[PDB]
């Protein structure tokens, strides 16, 4: 039959979906969410083997251990375990696009497994199996004789294996089919991989059971009373003397609890569902549930019969909130939420896509570290444990079916057909059955990236009517269609229309008042981080701030999705697509997170921590006002921590409990501050900090800060006269300046610094030289290939205009002697095909104290496109320990994703001056610096740098970090000017034009001295 | 036009309509219906099908339709004759004066259900006037109320021709017969004759 | 596979649904609704044998024609040839409800019939059978092969014959299952042929 090759047979003989269970048989277990006997897993070793069609599988395998499988664990993903090559491909399918078919090639994974099975379990009662995550389809046979069918590979399936068992050892057999008629739903941007890749489970059930129930908690005007409803069914035969109870725990305490015979209320004329009842449970003053403070209860459901005896419970955790939309806001228990979301992807880099409790954990609280407070599935339903962790350490989520089918043409080719309706149907009504008792879900998504087509809007209206208490939301087909109850664009801009026939994708702003439109606004997607990014990051927020139906959004995304190799000598490295061989690939674009696949962060983390701050700022005189974004909760957990620094020397400091209610003021009055013996700015930093530790956060974490200048006292103190005079040294080839121990040499042919002495040691390896480049980031390549140019990209204007290949061509070049100083003035021109692109003229003035002033003048052809610097640069000969600057920092910053460093005197290893982004580019840059120190070098002035073993050539010339090499020497790069990076999307120029070097004439300064 | 869609004898009447798993099965009994049909100018309102009470695979495929072929309305009686799957108020023997107030579908007077808080919909019998045997007493009733009320819009009565089947006696002479006379059983036996018409078209 | 026991399969192998079509080559006929020689009617003298099981089916009736079989005219309902009685229930359905299961005795109509397919047919383009109507669901076979199977008694369903008919004669056999699990969608107040 082929089955794999039909739209219409997407399982055969599956059991219906239901939420978690367990089957516990003692309702203490149930109430307490205890191991239960009757759930086992069958994770651990199996038996498995490759082949490259099913037709090439031996009947044999049926019903015996093929000798030539391996023993491997399971849950995994084949391509893991270097059976066959994983393939990163973005939009494109990794198939020929000829639905419903599959490639003739397609491979085929044989596991299985021999197991014991208890007499106990099969003398009475139902055994079924469950396969949590199944990648793409698959048949099943237990004891050699066939049993069933499955598709989706992101829901469990489940089949009844009571009468294929029997007591002691048992064999299952399960073919799995990479590629099936559910891969053309099945094309989100990640690696495609297959296999067991959940859990398998074995789960003991009786005759008579529970077999779905249905938990919802409706509220009054005030929340202060609640009613919980819980619809159970049963299947089974009926008796009178049948019951259920429902009881709802808090901690220990039962608060309510309800018994009743089945026998529902009349529904139509032919009556009503007598395999069901509904109890209702009275709650006065519950503990509401938020992300901010997640308030749960149990509720624990009893099958049992009148005398009293227990038949079997089922459980789940409750949290009454209440969801819903009105007046154009996402209200949550009543107030607007201020969404500080996140997509993430179930990635590991050894493990692919296997999921496991301890890196889930980690995802949550590195996620709440930095301000998140939700996550949207992108874009599958997620292994079961998620929507546990989310429901009890508190993240809002959007729970998504597993339906994308980006590369069809048109987009909605499959979801505008009614012969698709059914495979669609089941992705959506599967989750929902599934997920529906989750409180962490507070919206449902019907996919990604599939168009818009009639079958969303009949399984929106679905959705709408099973599940009243979940808004639906969808972003395809132009991100407001009538799928969708949120506008919830991806990739659009703060302010910048991008009108696109079709699909528009208006300025966020503008998209809220376009005629006739009432919905808030949601992006599903948007400040894409791959690389060096998140530049603009902090313009989304104000303007979520600012507009109330503006209401966040989820940044696209969380964890890069890198994967581990091994080279000659066994050392890891990260890859990406093309690493395996694949092909096509769409190489580094599968690595977009906030964080390294082994979840340390880049950079750009703590710029989404600050932007995404709980506590809002303001500064009068002495006065602080401390403004609470919390909705609910008081801040019972948080101090404020205030200093004042004048130039990085500390004045004075100070702590203040903080005391604020949800969106309630603080006023803090700072103390009266002595003046300042000295010239400097003065600066005040303030923190607020939480003593205690959490679920989700130890003692001391700081959550939120904030700085001001205060004072400034400018410098008139004139010096103090030279106790030396600078001599010139004029020769045909150079000028060399002698000051003590010290010399400097510029070449009179070249017009630069070429040489510069410290007694008899050199201190370059390359002369000082003006830089107008950068290695190019992800963001200012975009999609540009080198078998694909985008002549629009950033690196392309720049190559074309010839800025990489410019060369200095000497205009001037004279030296003069003063009273107390030489000064050597010059003039270069950059030109290309005969254009000049770029002029600079500088001085450099050395005097009497040793200190050398340089002044920078650059005139930029305002033809030319910007550039993406105005600096110079050089190979410094030696190497230090340490980076030491009175500047932003600590860490990397550029000038439009800067808001999160603070001004102050950092002191750094140089390895933490470089950012080991997998893709090397332009890295390591901290702007707003004053005071540069390395090894016995000071540079003074108002500039951006970076300093690291790797020159900008080295950077643009290799594609993986692994294959960097220290160069000799440390090369400096100090910009007067430096570009945006972007990232509102890295497919298209994102740099903002206020971010753009577009002046035409620049300047800057610099000093130069020796410690 | 409508969906050959009716379980009017399940227990309650939406079991399989309410269960997504019948939703592929009723889903290609809709949209292959409109895939025929919808150039025939005479088709001007769809419906869902009958007697099935209410289910959530109606409201998905009465949105459906709605995306479809926004041309035409849809209607739908079960579950009430007024839920959310019907453009149209569409009841079934609903009387003119007389309410019945059935537990959870009511089938009310019709110049009282047009007027319900909060209702605006237009009113169309589905099947109104049973002309089962002697019968369409009352007939001129319903027609003084759709003249009287603009959204008194009219109906389908109960039903054109009866179902009766010919069969021949021991003379090889032909006679109408009706549910039970073929040995079935359990049947329901003369309620298949209800038209205005014998089966040979002879008018009653 | 038993698939008139599984909702989850209305249809295996139909082509897609779609207006009334006639393949005119030839447009004034198209603008006059003149028959169209593209169209071509399968009605009249069918093959027929009744048998009360999908199981008692012979595997001969496949490739040849039952001699026991009786030549009948389609389209008909084959309560009214007397092989079997038709019903009158309203609303109790006519059988056991336990969807999705059907009876095990399930009255299943053999049709079959003998027809010419001319060489210009087959030579270029697509050649598919269109069922107007057959209650309540469908297994095809043309010349022995399986094509394809159906539900819906209210619908038409259609198949490509492309690749399985030959020039001259060619049989088609049609096994029409009385019961299926379309039957829990087709309780209508009527008798049940
Ligand atoms: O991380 C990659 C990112 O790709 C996105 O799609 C990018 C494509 O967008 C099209 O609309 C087109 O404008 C192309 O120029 C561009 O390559 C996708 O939208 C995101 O979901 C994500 O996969
Ligand atoms: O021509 C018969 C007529 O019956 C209608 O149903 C009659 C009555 O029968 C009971 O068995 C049902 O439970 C009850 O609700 C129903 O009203 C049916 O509505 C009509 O369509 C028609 O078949
Ligand atoms: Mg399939
Ligand atoms: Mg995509
Ligand atoms: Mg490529
Ligand atoms: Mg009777
Ligand atoms: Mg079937
Ligand atoms: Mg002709
Ligand atoms: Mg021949
Ligand atoms: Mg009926
Ligand atoms: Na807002
Ligand atoms: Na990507
Ligand atoms: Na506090
Ligand atoms: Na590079
Ligand atoms: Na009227
Ligand atoms: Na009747």
New interface residues.
């Given amino acids: 039959?082929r089955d794999w090759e039909?739209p219409?047979?997407?399982?055969?003989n599956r059991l219906?979906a239901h939420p978690p269970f367990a089957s516990w048989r003692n309702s203490e277990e149930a109430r307490t969410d205890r191991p239960s006997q009757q759930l086992r897993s069958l994770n651990g070793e199996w038996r498995f083997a490759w082949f490259p069609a099913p037709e090439a599988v031996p009947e044999s395998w049926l019903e015996c251990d093929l000798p030539e499988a391996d023993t491997v664990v399971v849950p995994s993903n084949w391509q893991m375990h270097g059976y066959d090559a994983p393939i990163y491909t973005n939009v494109t399918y990794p198939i020929t696009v000829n639905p419903p078919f599959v490639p003739t090639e397609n491979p085929t994974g044989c596991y299985s497994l021999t197991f014991n099975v208890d007499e106990s379990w099969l003398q009475e009662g139902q055994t079924r199996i469950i396969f949590d995550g199944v990648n793409s389809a698959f048949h099943l046979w237990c004891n050699g004789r066939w049993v069933g069918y499955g598709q989706d590979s992101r829901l469990p399936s489940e089949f009844d294996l009571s009468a294929f068992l029997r007591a002691g050892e048992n064999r299952l057999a399960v073919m799995v089919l990479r590629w099936s008629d559910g891969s053309y739903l099945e094309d989100q941007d990640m690696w495609r991989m297959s296999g067991i890749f959940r859990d398998v489970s074995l789960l003991h059930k009786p005759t008579t059971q529970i077999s779905d129930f249905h938990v919802a908690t409706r509220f009054n005007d005030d929340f202060s009373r609640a009613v919980l409803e819980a619809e159970v069914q049963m299947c089974g035969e009926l008796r009178d003397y049948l019951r259920v109870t429902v009881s709802l725990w808090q901690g220990e305490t039962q608060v309510a609890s309800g018994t009743a015979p089945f026998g529902g209320?009349?529904?139509?004329?032919?009556?009503?569902?007598?395999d069901r009842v509904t109890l209702r449970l009275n709650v006065e003053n519950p503990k509401l549930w938020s992300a901010e403070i997640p308030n749960l209860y149990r509720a624990v459901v009893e099958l049992h019969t009148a005398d009293g005896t227990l038949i079997e419970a089922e459980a789940c955790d409750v949290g009454f909130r209440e969801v819903r939309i009105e007046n154009g806001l996402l209200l949550l228990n009543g107030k607007p939420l201020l969404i500080r979301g996140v997509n993430r992807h179930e990635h590991h880099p050894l493990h692919g896509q296997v999921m496991d409790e301890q890196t889930m954990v980690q995802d949550i609280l590195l996620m709440k570290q930095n301000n998140f407070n939700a996550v949207r599935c992108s874009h599958y339903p997620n292994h079961p444990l998620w929507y546990t962790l989310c429901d009890r350490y508190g993240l809002y989520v959007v729970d998504e079916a597993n339906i994308e089918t980006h590369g069809m043409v048109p987009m909605n080719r499959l979801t505008d057909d009614?012969?698709w309706?059914?495979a669609m149907?089941?992705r959506v009504?599967?989750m929902v059955?599934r997920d529906r008792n989750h409180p962490s879900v507070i919206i449902w998504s019907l996919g990604n990236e599939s168009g818009h087509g009639?079958?969303h809007?009949?399984?929106?209206?679905?959705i709408?009517?099973?599940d009243p208490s979940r808004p639906v939301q969808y972003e395809g087909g132009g991100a407001d269609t009538?799928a969708t109850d949120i506008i919830c664009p991806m990739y659009a801009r703060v302010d910048e229309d991008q009108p696109f026939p079709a699909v528009p994708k208006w300025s966020i702003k503008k998209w809220l008042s376009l005629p006739g439109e009432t919905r808030p606004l949601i992006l599903c997607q948007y400040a894409h981080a791959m690389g060096n990014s998140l530049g603009g990051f902090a313009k989304y927020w104000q303007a979520f701030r600012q507009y109330p139906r503006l209401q966040g959004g989820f940044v696209w995304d969380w964890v890069d999705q890198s994967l581990i190799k091994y080279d000659e000598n066994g050392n890891p490295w990260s890859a990406y697509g093309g690493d395996f061989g694949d092909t096509p690939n769409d190489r580094q674009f599968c690595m977009n997170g906030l964080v390294f696949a082994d979840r340390t962060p880049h950079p750009a983390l703590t710029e989404a921590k600050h932007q995404q701050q709980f506590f809002q700022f303001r500064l009068s005189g002495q006065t602080i006002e401390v403004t609470s974004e919390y909705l609910f909760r008081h801040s019972d957990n948080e101090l404020l921590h205030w200093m004042v620094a004048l130039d990085g020397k500390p004045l004075a400091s100070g702590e203040v409990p903080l005391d604020v209610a949800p969106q309630g003021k603080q006023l803090i009055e700072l103390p009266e501050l002595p003046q300042p013996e000295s010239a400097g700015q003065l600066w005040l930093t303030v923190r607020v900090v939480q003593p205690n530790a959490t679920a989700w956060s130890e003692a001391g974490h700081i959550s939120a800060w904030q700085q001001w200048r205060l004072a400034e006292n400018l410098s008139v103190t004139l010096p103090a006269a030279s106790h030396a005079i600078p001599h010139l040294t004029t020769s045909e080839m150079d000028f060399c300046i002698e000051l003590g121990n010290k010399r400097w040499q510029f070449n009179r042919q070249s017009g630069f610094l070429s040489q510069m002495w410290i007694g008899d040691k050199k201190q370059l390896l390359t002369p000082l030289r003006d830089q107008f480049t950068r290695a190019p980031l992800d963001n200012d390549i975009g999609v540009s290939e080198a078998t694909r140019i985008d002549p629009n990209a950033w690196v392309e204007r720049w190559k074309a205009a010839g800025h990489y290949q410019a060369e200095a061509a000497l205009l001037q070049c004279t030296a003069d002697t003063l009273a107390d100083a030489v000064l050597i003035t010059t003039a270069h021109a950059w030109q290309h095909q005969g254009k000049t692109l770029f002029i600079s003229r500088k001085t450099y003035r050395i005097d009497g104290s040793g200190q050398m002033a340089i002044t920078v003048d650059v005139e930029v052809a305002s033809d030319t496109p910007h550039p993406a610097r105005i600096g110079l640069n050089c190979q410094l000969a030696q190497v230090a320990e340490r980076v030491n600057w009175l500047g932003l920092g600590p860490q990397e910053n550029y000038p439009d994703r800067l808001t999160a460093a603070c001004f102050d005197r950092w002191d750094l290893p140089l390895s933490d001056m470089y950012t080991p982004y997998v893709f090397p580019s332009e890295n390591g840059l901290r702007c707003g610096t004053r005071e540069l120190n390395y090894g016995p070098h000071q540079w003074r002035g108002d500039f951006q740098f970076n300093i690291s073993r790797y020159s900008q050539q080295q950077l643009m010339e290799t594609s993986h970090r692994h294959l960097l090499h220290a160069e000799e020497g440390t090369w400096l790069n100090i910009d007067g000017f430096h570009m945006g990076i972007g990232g509102d999307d890295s497919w298209s120029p994102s740099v903002s034009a206020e971010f753009q070097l577009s002046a035409g004439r620049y300047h800057y300064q610099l000093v130069w001295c020796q410690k």
């Fill in positions: 039959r039909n219409g047979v997407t399982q055969l219906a209320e009349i529904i139509d004329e032919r009556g009503g569902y007598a009614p012969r309706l059914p149907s089941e009504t599967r059955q009639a079958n809007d009949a399984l929106y209206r679905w709408k009517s099973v009538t």
